[PDB]
């Protein structure tokens, strides 16, 4: 049995329990990943390794996370590029930017990736994103091409409440997003 848990409701100026990559930093008690600038990547990882399953017992972990974020666009027809919560190998570093959202490099399933990402995609990349050209929540495994999606209507500037849960008896990963209004 090993359990683990945390909660930060306000970020310090030196969050020493976080790893920042690319343009991530803390200001005003928020964790900011990209400012509204052209062509930049922002990543922040929790530093303790999480033990998600076991060679010896073959067990997998149940888990849940919940967070709050806003995306703040100059308007609603200039909005790029997205935001991801992901689970990755311990030495993870930022991958390819722009529509690849910092965590992947192709739409072709790459087993070496070892990354599960949940995404909140704000921009259609014609080459892999749903043909309906809508903003969407997606689950991706080892590829920038979601294995499943839901179209969601960005409320530019509002605070979204997300909960992600994974159940280890059922192998089901679920995502729900809530807007206040």
């Amino acid at each position: 049995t090993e359990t683990t848990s945390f909660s930060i409701t306000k970020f310090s100026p030196d969050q020493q329990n976080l790893i920042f990559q690319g343009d991530g930093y803390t200001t005003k008690g928020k964790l900011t990943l990209t400012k509204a600038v052209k062509s930049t990547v922002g990543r922040a990882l929790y530093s303790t390794p999480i033990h998600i399953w076991d060679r010896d017992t073959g067990n997998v972990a149940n888990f849940v996370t919940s967070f709050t974020f806003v995306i703040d666009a100059p308007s609603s027809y200039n909005v790029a590029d997205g935001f991801t919560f992901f689970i990755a190998p311990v030495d993870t570093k930022p991958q390819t930017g722009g529509g690849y959202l910092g965590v992947f490099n192709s739409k072709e399933y790459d087993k070496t990736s070892q990354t599960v990402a949940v995404e909140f995609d704000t921009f259609y990349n014609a080459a892999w994103d749903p043909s309906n050209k809508e903003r969407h929540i997606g689950i991706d495994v080892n590829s920038i091409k979601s294995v499943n999606t839901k179209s969601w209507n960005l409320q530019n500037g509002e605070r979204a409440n997300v909960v992600i849960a994974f159940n280890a008896a059922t192998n089901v990963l679920t995502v729900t997003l809530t807007y206040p209004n």
């Binding site: 922040a44 990882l45 997998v60 929540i137 997606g138 499943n148």
Partner: protein, 47 residues
């Protein structure tokens, strides 16, 4: 209140190593925006 739910079967034992880090990612390109987390909490129980 406007909610959206998605779900799928992912077989975690086979995609990812026994030990993982967790975190958040964002990017801009030609177009852009500011993305920001205001709070984060996590719990897992293995075994």
């Amino acid at each position: 209140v406007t909610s959206y739910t998605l779900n799928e079967v992912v077989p975690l034992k086979d995609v990812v190593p026994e030990w993982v880090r967790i975190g958040f990612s964002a990017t801009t390109g030609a177009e852009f925006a500011a993305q920001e987390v205001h709070s984060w909490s996590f719990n897992s129980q293995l075994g």
